[PDB]
């Protein structure tokens, strides 16, 4: 078995191990990490309360923009916040395309422009 | 906006198939219909039927330990599970993305393996290739 794709980044200087998933239409951060980072009233509540997706999972709202630090590179980031999502942050196919990112597995990093951000080892779950 | 999801075309035993490129999927998986369509049932080892390794309720028809897949004009050895009713013909997971040291280049919209880039299929190509 292989280690899934995780990358380290600070969000308002709060380190998050983001899970990079090219099979996700949307980028998403759970409420617990949204609480830890400090972004709980930047939310644009347009999908809360009666979330029309018929699940248990409630959508807190939508952070339109907050800066993310990938090894010194600062990027405008956008994503959804959900209450009972088990992972800190999802880097969706949206952000992966918008910032024209490259999932490199021969060199094993997420390459953005000239900034290579290695993937985390197995000892880091 | 909702972005196009990532698919590449390829062939297994002369037969044309489109493959979903999922960096969050730990396993490569092919539906029963496709392997039947590609003549791969005889290769399906049925010793591991009824197991589940994933998140979901996963119940496989078996595992294909090696089949040649012509991706990027190169013959590339794949291994994947076979599961009867899966919406998607073929999923390229993180096992094979890593096994063949692939590159998912969303700047120039292509899948790079060796010196060859397969461009991701355009949105209007997805729901017509079988």
Short mmCIF file of C-alpha atoms in Angstrom, two decimals:
data_model
loop_
_atom_site.label_atom_id
_atom_site.label_comp_id
_atom_site.label_asym_id
_atom_site.label_seq_id
_atom_site.Cartn_x
_atom_site.Cartn_y
_atom_site.Cartn_z
CA UNK A 1 0.00 0.00 0.00
CA UNK A 2 1.07 3.57 -0.75
CA UNK A 3 0.89 6.82 1.02
CA UNK A 4 -1.82 9.22 -0.21
CA UNK A 5 -0.97 12.70 -1.34
CA UNK A 6 -0.52 15.17 1.54
CA UNK A 7 1.20 18.53 1.42
CA UNK A 8 2.15 20.92 4.27
CA UNK A 9 0.95 24.48 4.25
CA UNK A 10 0.19 27.29 6.67
CA UNK A 11 -3.12 29.10 6.55
CA UNK A 12 -2.75 32.31 8.58
CA UNK A 13 0.32 30.65 10.00
CA UNK A 14 -1.58 27.52 11.09
CA UNK A 15 -0.04 24.45 9.52
CA UNK A 16 -2.41 22.18 7.63
CA UNK A 17 -1.62 18.84 6.03
CA UNK A 18 -3.76 19.22 2.92
CA UNK A 19 -4.86 16.08 1.08
CA UNK A 20 -4.45 16.47 -2.65
CA UNK A 21 -7.19 14.71 -4.56
CA UNK A 22 -7.60 15.22 -8.30
CA UNK A 23 -10.86 13.26 -8.19
CA UNK A 24 -12.64 15.88 -6.09
CA UNK A 25 -14.65 18.52 -7.91
CA UNK A 26 -14.35 20.88 -4.93
CA UNK A 27 -11.71 22.05 -2.43
CA UNK A 28 -12.89 21.66 1.16
CA UNK A 29 -11.71 22.35 4.71
CA UNK A 30 -13.40 20.85 7.77
CA UNK A 31 -14.86 23.11 10.48
CA UNK A 32 -12.33 21.90 13.13
CA UNK A 33 -9.41 23.09 10.96
CA UNK A 34 -11.36 26.16 9.90
CA UNK A 35 -11.70 26.87 13.69
CA UNK A 36 -8.03 26.20 14.33
CA UNK A 37 -6.89 28.51 11.45
CA UNK A 38 -9.19 31.37 12.38
CA UNK A 39 -11.62 31.73 9.48
CA UNK A 40 -15.06 31.03 10.93
CA UNK A 41 -16.69 34.48 10.33
CA UNK A 42 -15.17 35.09 6.83
CA UNK A 43 -17.70 32.45 5.74
CA UNK A 44 -20.29 33.51 3.08
CA UNK A 45 -23.24 31.65 4.36
CA UNK A 46 -25.25 30.79 1.23
CA UNK A 47 -25.43 26.97 1.64
CA UNK A 48 -25.81 26.51 5.48
CA UNK A 49 -28.72 25.24 7.48
CA UNK A 50 -30.81 23.56 4.73
CA UNK A 51 -27.95 22.23 2.56
CA UNK A 52 -29.77 20.78 -0.46
CA UNK A 53 -27.49 17.75 -0.82
CA UNK A 54 -29.63 15.50 1.39
CA UNK A 55 -26.78 14.40 3.62
CA UNK A 56 -25.97 14.47 7.34
CA UNK A 57 -23.03 16.76 6.41
CA UNK A 58 -23.85 20.41 6.81
CA UNK A 59 -22.04 22.96 4.71
CA UNK A 60 -20.88 25.79 7.00
CA UNK A 61 -20.51 28.16 4.05
CA UNK A 62 -17.85 29.27 1.54
CA UNK A 63 -14.59 31.09 2.08
CA UNK A 64 -14.10 33.10 -1.03
CA UNK A 65 -10.46 33.94 -0.47
CA UNK A 66 -7.76 33.35 2.10
CA UNK A 67 -4.01 33.14 1.50
CA UNK A 68 -2.28 29.70 1.61
CA UNK A 69 1.41 29.21 2.04
CA UNK A 70 3.04 26.44 0.01
CA UNK A 71 6.73 26.52 1.01
CA UNK A 72 6.88 30.32 0.95
CA UNK A 73 4.61 30.72 -2.04
CA UNK A 74 1.44 32.57 -1.10
CA UNK A 75 -1.66 31.82 -3.08
CA UNK A 76 -5.26 32.98 -3.06
CA UNK A 77 -7.32 29.97 -2.02
CA UNK A 78 -11.04 29.21 -2.15
CA UNK A 79 -12.98 26.34 -0.62
CA UNK A 80 -15.99 25.03 1.26
CA UNK A 81 -16.22 24.36 4.97
CA UNK A 82 -18.10 21.31 6.24
CA UNK A 83 -18.94 20.27 9.82
CA UNK A 84 -18.22 16.50 9.90
CA UNK A 85 -15.52 16.12 7.25
CA UNK A 86 -12.80 13.84 8.68
CA UNK A 87 -9.81 15.53 6.96
CA UNK A 88 -8.31 18.95 7.54
CA UNK A 89 -8.27 20.22 3.96
CA UNK A 90 -9.02 18.94 0.46
CA UNK A 91 -7.16 20.45 -2.50
CA UNK A 92 -9.81 19.87 -5.16
CA UNK A 93 -9.51 19.75 -8.90
CA UNK A 94 -10.69 23.36 -8.93
CA UNK A 95 -7.65 24.85 -7.17
CA UNK A 96 -5.39 22.29 -8.81
CA UNK A 97 -6.50 23.65 -12.21
CA UNK A 98 -6.91 27.35 -11.27
CA UNK A 99 -3.30 27.62 -9.99
CA UNK A 100 -2.16 25.33 -12.81
CA UNK A 101 -0.60 22.87 -10.34
CA UNK A 102 1.34 19.77 -11.23
CA UNK A 103 1.01 16.57 -9.27
CA UNK A 104 4.49 15.15 -9.74
CA UNK A 105 5.06 11.55 -8.68
CA UNK A 106 8.34 10.83 -10.52
CA UNK A 107 9.97 13.60 -8.50
CA UNK A 108 7.30 13.27 -5.78
CA UNK A 109 6.10 16.85 -5.13
CA UNK A 110 3.34 19.31 -5.93
CA UNK A 111 5.00 21.73 -8.34
CA UNK A 112 3.50 25.24 -8.61
CA UNK A 113 5.46 27.45 -10.99
CA UNK A 114 9.06 26.96 -9.84
CA UNK A 115 8.01 26.00 -6.24
CA UNK A 116 8.30 22.32 -5.46
CA UNK A 117 6.52 21.14 -2.35
CA UNK A 118 7.52 17.50 -1.51
CA UNK A 119 4.84 15.05 -0.43
CA UNK A 120 4.80 13.90 3.16
CA UNK A 121 6.28 10.55 4.19
CA UNK A 122 4.38 7.48 5.44
CA UNK A 123 5.43 8.31 9.00
CA UNK A 124 3.09 11.32 8.66
CA UNK A 125 -0.62 10.16 8.71
CA UNK B 1 -18.31 26.83 -12.87
CA UNK B 2 -17.87 23.13 -12.40
CA UNK B 3 -14.53 21.95 -13.86
CA UNK B 4 -14.20 18.97 -16.17
CA UNK B 5 -12.94 15.86 -14.30
CA UNK B 6 -9.73 14.23 -15.61
CA UNK B 7 -10.05 11.39 -18.12
CA UNK B 8 -7.52 9.98 -20.54
CA UNK B 9 -8.15 7.61 -23.42
CA UNK B 10 -6.25 4.32 -23.83
CA UNK B 11 -6.65 0.79 -25.27
CA UNK B 12 -6.59 -2.70 -23.71
CA UNK B 13 -6.36 -5.52 -26.26
CA UNK B 14 -7.21 -3.20 -29.18
CA UNK B 15 -10.40 -1.94 -27.42
CA UNK B 16 -10.85 1.73 -26.69
CA UNK B 17 -11.41 2.80 -23.08
CA UNK B 18 -11.46 6.02 -21.14
CA UNK B 19 -9.77 6.12 -17.72
CA UNK B 20 -10.45 8.43 -14.74
CA UNK B 21 -7.31 9.89 -13.16
CA UNK B 22 -7.94 10.05 -9.37
CA UNK B 23 -5.07 11.06 -7.12
CA UNK B 24 -7.24 10.50 -4.09
CA UNK B 25 -8.04 6.84 -4.96
CA UNK B 26 -5.64 4.41 -3.41
CA UNK B 27 -6.66 1.50 -5.80
CA UNK B 28 -7.11 1.18 -9.57
CA UNK B 29 -10.45 -0.46 -10.37
CA UNK B 30 -12.16 -1.56 -13.56
CA UNK B 31 -15.83 -2.45 -13.94
CA UNK B 32 -16.89 -5.99 -14.90
CA UNK B 33 -18.40 -4.75 -18.14
CA UNK B 34 -15.11 -3.26 -19.33
CA UNK B 35 -12.94 -6.27 -18.58
CA UNK B 36 -15.59 -8.39 -20.27
CA UNK B 37 -15.49 -5.89 -23.14
CA UNK B 38 -11.69 -6.16 -23.21
CA UNK B 39 -11.67 -9.97 -22.86
CA UNK B 40 -10.02 -9.91 -19.38
CA UNK B 41 -12.25 -12.26 -17.35
CA UNK B 42 -9.96 -15.20 -17.95
CA UNK B 43 -7.20 -13.10 -16.28
CA UNK B 44 -9.35 -12.25 -13.26
CA UNK B 45 -7.92 -14.07 -10.25
CA UNK B 46 -10.96 -14.88 -8.10
CA UNK B 47 -9.09 -15.74 -4.88
CA UNK B 48 -9.71 -12.37 -3.30
CA UNK B 49 -13.53 -12.05 -4.04
CA UNK B 50 -15.66 -10.43 -1.33
CA UNK B 51 -12.78 -8.48 0.28
CA UNK B 52 -12.97 -4.69 0.93
CA UNK B 53 -9.83 -2.48 1.24
CA UNK B 54 -11.36 0.93 0.62
CA UNK B 55 -13.57 3.33 2.48
CA UNK B 56 -16.78 2.24 0.83
CA UNK B 57 -18.71 -0.93 0.76
CA UNK B 58 -16.21 -2.49 -1.70
CA UNK B 59 -16.94 -6.01 -3.08
CA UNK B 60 -14.67 -7.04 -5.89
CA UNK B 61 -15.00 -9.69 -8.59
CA UNK B 62 -11.21 -10.19 -8.35
CA UNK B 63 -7.89 -8.58 -9.16
CA UNK B 64 -6.09 -8.41 -12.54
CA UNK B 65 -2.42 -8.62 -11.57
CA UNK B 66 -1.05 -7.61 -14.96
CA UNK B 67 -2.71 -6.58 -18.16
CA UNK B 68 -1.14 -4.49 -20.87
CA UNK B 69 -2.68 -1.03 -21.35
CA UNK B 70 -1.61 1.21 -24.21
CA UNK B 71 -1.35 4.59 -22.54
CA UNK B 72 0.52 7.49 -24.14
CA UNK B 73 1.32 5.21 -27.04
CA UNK B 74 3.33 2.97 -24.68
CA UNK B 75 2.44 -0.49 -23.40
CA UNK B 76 2.12 -0.06 -19.63
CA UNK B 77 1.49 -2.93 -17.21
CA UNK B 78 -1.56 -2.28 -15.00
CA UNK B 79 -2.95 -4.13 -11.99
CA UNK B 80 -6.43 -3.41 -10.76
CA UNK B 81 -9.47 -4.78 -9.01
CA UNK B 82 -12.55 -5.77 -10.93
CA UNK B 83 -15.92 -4.73 -9.49
CA UNK B 84 -19.25 -5.48 -11.23
CA UNK B 85 -21.42 -2.29 -11.17
CA UNK B 86 -19.09 0.69 -11.15
CA UNK B 87 -20.25 3.77 -13.04
CA UNK B 88 -16.73 4.46 -14.38
CA UNK B 89 -15.06 2.04 -16.76
CA UNK B 90 -11.56 2.45 -15.40
CA UNK B 91 -10.00 4.38 -12.61
CA UNK B 92 -6.28 5.18 -12.65
CA UNK B 93 -5.49 5.39 -8.90
CA UNK B 94 -2.51 6.53 -6.91
CA UNK B 95 -0.96 3.04 -7.09
CA UNK B 96 -0.45 3.19 -10.90
CA UNK B 97 0.18 6.97 -10.92
CA UNK B 98 3.02 6.17 -8.54
CA UNK B 99 4.07 2.85 -10.04
CA UNK B 100 4.71 4.47 -13.42
CA UNK B 101 5.92 7.81 -12.00
CA UNK B 102 3.24 9.74 -13.85
CA UNK B 103 2.75 13.47 -13.86
CA UNK B 104 -0.68 15.09 -13.69
CA UNK B 105 0.08 18.37 -15.38
CA UNK B 106 -2.85 20.81 -15.02
CA UNK B 107 -0.93 23.66 -16.49
CA UNK B 108 -0.79 22.19 -20.02
CA UNK B 109 -3.75 19.81 -19.31
CA UNK B 110 -1.96 16.44 -19.98
CA UNK B 111 -0.83 13.22 -18.39
CA UNK B 112 2.85 12.78 -18.70
CA UNK B 113 4.46 9.31 -18.63
CA UNK B 114 8.06 8.96 -19.94
CA UNK B 115 8.55 11.56 -22.74
CA UNK B 116 4.83 11.52 -23.78
CA UNK B 117 1.88 13.68 -22.74
CA UNK B 118 -1.70 12.43 -23.17
CA UNK B 119 -4.08 15.41 -23.06
CA UNK B 120 -7.13 15.12 -20.83
CA UNK B 121 -10.26 14.64 -22.70
CA UNK B 122 -12.43 17.72 -23.26
CA UNK B 123 -15.77 17.92 -21.50
CA UNK B 124 -17.67 17.31 -24.70
CA UNK B 125 -15.72 14.00 -25.22
CA UNK B 126 -16.68 12.26 -21.90
CA UNK B 127 -20.28 10.89 -22.34
CA UNK B 128 -19.90 9.31 -25.75
CA UNK B 129 -16.76 7.02 -25.60
CA UNK B 130 -17.57 3.48 -24.51
#
